[PDB]
Amino acid sequence: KSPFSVKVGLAQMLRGGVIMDVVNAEQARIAEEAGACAVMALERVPADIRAQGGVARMSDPQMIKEIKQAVTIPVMAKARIGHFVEAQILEAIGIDYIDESEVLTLADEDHHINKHNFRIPFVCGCRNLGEALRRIREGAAMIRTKGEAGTGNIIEAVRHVRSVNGDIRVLRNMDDDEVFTFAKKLAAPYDLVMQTKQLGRLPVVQFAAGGVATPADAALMMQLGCDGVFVGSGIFKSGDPARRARAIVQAVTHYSDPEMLVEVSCGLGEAMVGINL
Amino acid sequence: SPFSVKVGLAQMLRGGVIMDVVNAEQARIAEEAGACAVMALERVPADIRAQGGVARMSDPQMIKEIKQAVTIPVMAKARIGHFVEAQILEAIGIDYIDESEVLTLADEDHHINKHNFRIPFVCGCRNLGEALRRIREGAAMIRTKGEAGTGNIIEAVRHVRSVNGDIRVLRNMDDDEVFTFAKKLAAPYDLVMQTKQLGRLPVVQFAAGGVATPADAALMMQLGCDGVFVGSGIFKSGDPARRARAIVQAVTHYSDPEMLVEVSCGLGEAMVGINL
Amino acid sequence: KSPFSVKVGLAQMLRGGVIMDVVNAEQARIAEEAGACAVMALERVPADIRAQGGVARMSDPQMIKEIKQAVTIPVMAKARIGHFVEAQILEAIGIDYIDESEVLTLADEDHHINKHNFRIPFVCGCRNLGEALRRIREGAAMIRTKGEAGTGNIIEAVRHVRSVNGDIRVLRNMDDDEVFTFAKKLAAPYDLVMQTKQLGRLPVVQFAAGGVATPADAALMMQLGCDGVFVGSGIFKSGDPARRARAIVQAVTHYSDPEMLVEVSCGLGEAMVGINL
Amino acid sequence: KSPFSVKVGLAQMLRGGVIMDVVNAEQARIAEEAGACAVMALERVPADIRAQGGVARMSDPQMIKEIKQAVTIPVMAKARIGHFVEAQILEAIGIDYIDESEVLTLADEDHHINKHNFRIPFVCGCRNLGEALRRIREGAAMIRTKGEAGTGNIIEAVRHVRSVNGDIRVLRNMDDDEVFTFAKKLAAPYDLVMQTKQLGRLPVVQFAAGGVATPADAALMMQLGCDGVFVGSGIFKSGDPARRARAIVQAVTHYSDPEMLVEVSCGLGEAMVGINL
Amino acid sequence: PFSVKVGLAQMLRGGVIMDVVNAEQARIAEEAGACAVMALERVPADIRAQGGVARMSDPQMIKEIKQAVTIPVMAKARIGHFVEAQILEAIGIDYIDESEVLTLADEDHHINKHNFRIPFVCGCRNLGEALRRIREGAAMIRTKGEAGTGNIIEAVRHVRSVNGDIRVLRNMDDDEVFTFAKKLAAPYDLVMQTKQLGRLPVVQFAAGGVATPADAALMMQLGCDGVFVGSGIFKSGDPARRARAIVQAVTHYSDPEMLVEVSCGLGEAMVGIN
Ligand SMILES: [Cl-]
Ligand SMILES: [Cl-]
Ligand SMILES: [Cl-]
Ligand SMILES: [Cl-]
Ligand SMILES: [Cl-]
Ligand SMILES: [Cl-]
């Protein structure tokens, strides 16, 4: 198996999981104790990046090391889009995944990181199938929806999931002779388009992200065909994070069980208020 | 059919007022004033409008508290397209789901597939095409969208006259022209024809959005509605129990001006609202 | 005589009069004592509706009953445009006229009340001859100018009076064969256009309203050919309402007597400040 | 019976008929022998007016007298729109109807003839219900569709018939309170709009005209609800002009009988070629 | 019943329908193996070139064609001209084509085809249009293609559009079908029927610009049930030969050796217009 396949295989172990944003070791422990499949180490949640502005960069390696030592589940961290040196540093710290993330301040407007130059697997965002496939061709081993970051509004995530999955379904029964033109119109590599056609799904793990605020939101993403979910702001910017954390984890595990969804949602305290754009 | 059963259930609400309530005391006041059902929520449309934020399905705990406090039917709101919010609501054991545009839209392109549920749904509309599209998706009851949270009836009047006006056009239309009419409404032809034959919407049809006074409520009834929703209009007024009873009576006695005078007389401050 | 003629006849008794807005029984008494020909009962004057905003509706029947009991002159009250139930309620209270009024919040954007379904006479606003005739065909028994409400600026009333009267004068000597096209261009019913031509004036009583703030303003409206005037804000939002009320009444009665106009205007105290749009 | 009701009654005798354009007495005789209910005397058919251009006016009274003497059925003739003196002349010749016709050169861009000043009944064209009602208010006793003149293409006639009849149907069940606004939007007299509502059809005889080239076209107009048809150009250029005339007459009389329509259409010779605009 | 009319048209599957202007041509079409003939007084290439108003053909010429052959006879009525259709039905022909090559008679409404006993064919350019025509009572659908040019480009476009949207619909999330029906402006029930069947619920032919055997076989390889040919045939050295070649191309559409043979030495195709 190729080095890319190995990275793809590693991310498959996250299936059925919730990845939680954490700003310190206590939060990392709460996330792990609630049953998160991984933590995403950062110095500012997307809701605070949105509200405060400023330039948002890779976190101090010291804070990332503190998180990595506090838990036994995988640790991810964010690098700015195109900032291949930030990614070099992260990889050298010994974390498990890099998220080349649009919630940080864009560092390169025209090019993403060449992810094939790394041993560590990367996650990238997308809003549509063409974007997902372009990120994979650059070497992303996992894809998430961009959703809308820091608002608690699931609308954009739903749009992106339906866009990606919808185009995958179109591709499945398409006349093979029309696939060349479809690849052109997606601006995506033809070989990856054909692989997606043969598989009937994205050739890497696909998670939802952006605006998941409630257990209902998380389960909705799973019922729409995601492999798992990222939660950022939605937890520690809520009234009771440990309980809310557990509730989201349970919602993802038991996504097709309305009785369970009722139980975990019942009396959950204040959700993040967020912002309607 | 299971659809015809849901549609038959909603018929009991004809002649009624459905009231928004935020707690059990309010649910009791609504029931005692003679509401035909209550709509459980954590924020009235006037406060959603004023405060903003993302508005979602209410905590199932608060909904259970309301459902235990009254013996009339309980409805609750789910965001448009949020089929999992609807699954949760159904699992709580309430009577109706309102797939509601006053909450924050969750799916810009698709509504809930309401036929996948046992519980009946209410949906909003602004015109006949929209009403028929919602019914085809499985709505068992339709309301006007009106304008939410303003106390201004103008939009509800516009929507009621739009829906009823197109129904009246359809009634005497040349049959050969109905195909093109269905196309122009972007509505399913079979439901268009059913509406033509019936001379009205094939489900219960209520007014909603901006009903603030007994006069407003009776106006909606005189324009041909089966009943009215009231949200903000009550508990954001000076005396809600009194105002609640007055709206109920107005709907029951909608063609009786002497009664309308009596229930409107000395009612205290209506919601101030907003001219948008 | 037809029921419409009876209503028209009843409004003719207001000719030469001033109709005053009043918010309580004391004000109604002051208006009556100053010689108003009728009072218009309401919970908010147009200057306060303009300043405060909010939805403005039919007044509480209790306050209207209190006004009706406090005076022996006719009582009018306002209903929102198109709100035929508000009008039903007013008629059932036993007042003398309904004003289907644009100073309240519009209830029906496309249709006015079908005024022929009522026994009580209605007043409606207009800005031009076509609008006046459309209101009359719907069953208005009296017409007023819309003017500009709540500003104390007479400019719009003058515009509307000159527009209506000017088109009436055009109509008077017009070639009969051209009247069909004129009716079309006014979007007014041909029969009412011809009746106006034969009469040489509106077939109902015509009052000025909107922005009448001084005795000079009131007399100007009368010299321009109005049958009487409405005053709202212009009085009780002035420095001394009882004196100002009397002065306006006298100005309307003695509109062509400059010596009298001087006397009633002399030392009148502060007029409403208003707003120049 | 008002003088208008008498004119309207006279035109009702044409119901179920075909009116044919004729340029001389021989053609008038052929039209009558084929069973036309009336003839329309003119010096140029609409297909020649279209092709040649020039100013098209009232026909020479000599040629109209020659036609009127050649037949015992009613004789109509055309006057230019607004040309009330052409209409005076026609009436003084002693013909039976005047067509105030848009196929002649417009004489008054803003005003039609005041048809109430004449004893003779008039026919006017329309494209929609508002136009029809405006012509009737001016005194038209009969209405035809304008269709498209001189092309042999029935599309416009169908459009106009469906427009008029469609709006009549809308009007029939409309909320009475909404009829005022409907009259305004049609720019039509309210009283005539209400009369049409009560009757459920136009208050005068209504014929199709413009582009009727075949028996199928004629019967189509009748099945769409017309009282009869005008034919101009569609007839007289033929192998056997008399045969096409008879076929159209039979089609109108037997409009709901497909077997009869087959028979009269079978082997009819060349129809007018016409023009697709 | 509608299902009877739809069943009848299914017999035309694997066929070529040929435009004919007289009885000799109808005989040649039948002898060459056409599954039906379309009677008309002017081919679409002459309608295009000459202009004028184009209407239903004289019933006499239609009767002459119907007597000359034993295969089904179709004829054209103008869009919305329901009386032309009444007349055609009364002559006793087998199908009516409510046709856009004739001059449009109603800009806003088609014939209400359910009021007739005879099956109708209608044109389309896309799936929404096809479903609307079917709901009005069409028992068979054809591509509009481009009429009277001999250029297959528009037929290819329309076939790919219809079939492409059918394939999209087949594996679409059921919850998304309501919005898809709205966007097609098509009746939801017919959209769902199409989804369940995986094809149009009536027979679907290619038409417009089929000029060669290669064109005909291309339409079959793209998933059509058969083809219409108009202009493409009768102006020829040996009209009978081109007719037979197209029939054979449709029957043997996946056999390149056969396609070579029938195309070899065929004489001048219609010149047409780009
Ligand atoms: Cl940025
Ligand atoms: Cl929203
Ligand atoms: Cl307003
Ligand atoms: Cl002209
Ligand atoms: Cl009138
Ligand atoms: Cl055309």
Annotate chain E with DSSP letters as a single string: -HHHHHHHHGGGTTEEEEEESSHHHHHHHHHTT-SEEEE-SS-HHHHHHH-S---PPPHHHHHHHHHH-SS-EEEEEETT-HHHHHHHHHHT-SEEEEETTSPPS-SS----GGG-SS-EEEEESSHHHHHHHHHTT-SEEEE---TTS--THHHHHHHHHHHHHHHHHHTS-GGGHHHHHHHHT--HHHHHHHHHHTS-SSEEEB-S---SHHHHHHHHHTT-SEEEESHHHHSSSSHHHHHHHHHHHHHTTT-HHHHHHHHTT--PPP----
Experimental technique used to determine this entry? X-ray
CA distance D76 to D95: 6
What residues in E contact A175, CB-CB < 8 Å? 163-164, 167
Ligand closest to the CA atom of residue D55: 4
Q: Which residue stretches of A145-254 are H helix?
A: 155-172, 179-186, 190-199, 215-223, 233-236, 241-253
Q: Which residue stretches of chain D are H helix?
A: 3-11, 25-33, 46-52, 61-70, 84-93, 129-137, 155-172, 179-186, 190-199, 215-223, 233-236, 241-253, 258-265
Indicate which residue of A7, A65, A68, A78 is catalytic.
A78
> Is C55 an interface residue toward B (CB < 8 Å)?
yes
Residue contact B153–C109, C-beta within 8 A: no
φ/ψ (deg, to 5) at C32: -65, -40
φ/ψ (deg, to 5) at B21: -140, 140
Task: Copy the structure tokens of residue E245.
Answer: 């070649």
Task: Copy the structure tokens of residue B35.
Answer: 């509401």
Q: How many CB pairs under 8 A join B and C?
A: 79
Is A21 annotated to bind a ligand? Reply is: yes
User: Cβ(D5)–Cβ(D136) under 8 Å?
Assistant: no
Q: What is the resolution of this structure in A?
A: 1.9
Residue A210's contacts (CB-CB under 8 Å, 6 or more residues apart) are A46, A145, A146, A147, A148, A149, A156, A157, A230
User: Cβ(C143)–Cβ(C202) under 8 Å?
Assistant: yes
Residue contact A175–E168, C-beta within 8 A: no
Task: Copy the structure tokens of residue C246.
Answer: 């009397």
Query: How much distance in Å is there from the Cα of B172 to the middle of ligand 6?
Result: 30
Residue in D158, D161, D162, D169 to test binding to B, most B beta-carbons within 10 Å: D169
- Beta-strand ranges (E) seen in chain A are 17-22, 38-41, 75-80, 97-101, 122-126, 142-145, 205-207, 228-231
What residues in D contact B172, CB-CB < 8 Å? 169-170, 172-173
Q: Binding site for D-glyceraldehyde 3-phosphate, residues of B? A: 161
Q: What is the CB neighbour count within 10 angstroms for residue E105?
A: 29
Is C211 annotated to bind a ligand? Reply is: yes
Residue D257's contacts (CB-CB under 8 Å, 6 or more residues apart) are none
Nearest CA in chain B to E80: B176
User: Cβ(B140)–Cβ(B5) under 8 Å?
Assistant: no
User: Cβ(C19)–Cβ(C76) under 8 Å?
Assistant: yes
Half-sphere exposure of residue D21: CA atoms within 13 angstroms, side-chain side: 27
> Is D55 an interface residue toward E (CB < 8 Å)?
no
CA distance C213 to C271: 7
Indicate which residue of D68, D78, D115, D146 is catalytic.
D78
User: Cβ(E131)–Cβ(E190) under 8 Å?
Assistant: yes
Looking at the DSSP bridge assignments, the partners of residue D18 are D229
Residue contact C190–D84, C-beta within 8 A: no
CA D23 to the chain's CA centroid: 17
Chain D touching partners, 3 or more CB pairs below 8 A:
B, C, E
CATH number of residue D186's parent domain:
3.20.20.70
- What is the three-class DSSP state of D123? strand
DSSP string, chain C: --HHHHHHHHHGGGTTEEEEEESSHHHHHHHHHTT-SEEEE-SS-HHHHHHH-S---PPPHHHHHHHHHH-SS-EEEEEETT-HHHHHHHHHHT-SEEEEETTSPPS-SS----GGG-SS-EEEEESSHHHHHHHHHTT-SEEEE---SSS--THHHHHHHHHHHHHHHHHHTS-GGGHHHHHHHHT--HHHHHHHHHHTS-SSEEEB-S---SHHHHHHHHHTT-SEEEESHHHHTSS-HHHHHHHHHHHHHTTT-HHHHHHHHTT--PPP-----
CA distance D134 to D112: 10
DSSP string, E55-70: -PPPHHHHHHHHHH-S
CA distance C148 to A182: 61
Residue contact C54–B275, C-beta within 8 A: yes
φ/ψ (deg, to 5) at E177: -65, -30
- What is the three-class DSSP state of D80? strand
> Is B136 an interface residue toward E (CB < 8 Å)?
yes
CA distance D136 to D269: 39
Render the burial of D199-211: b for 16+ CB within 10 Å, e for the rest.
eeebbbbbbbbbb
User: Cβ(C14)–Cβ(C38) under 8 Å?
Assistant: yes
Half-sphere exposure of residue A179: CA atoms within 13 angstroms, side-chain side: 18
| Total number of domains constituting chain E | 1
What residues in B contact C111, CB-CB < 8 Å? 161
Query: How much distance in Å is there from the Cα of E103 to the middle of ligand 6?
Result: 4
Residue contact D190–C187, C-beta within 8 A: no
CA–CA min distance A18, chain B (Å): 18
Domain limits for position B199: 1-276
Q: B230: part of which helix (H) or strand (E)? A: strand B227-230
Looking at the DSSP bridge assignments, the partners of residue B17 are B228
Q: At C19, which amino acid appears?
A: I
Task: Copy the structure tokens of residue E116.
Answer: 């007739």
What residues in D contact E80, CB-CB < 8 Å? 158
Indicate which residue of E5, E63, E66, E76 is catalytic.
E76
> Is B106 an interface residue toward E (CB < 8 Å)?
no
Half-sphere exposure of residue A153: CA atoms within 13 angstroms, side-chain side: 20
Half-sphere exposure of residue D258: CA atoms within 13 angstroms, side-chain side: 13
DSSP string, C81-132: TT-HHHHHHHHHHT-SEEEEETTSPPS-SS----GGG-SS-EEEEESSHHHH
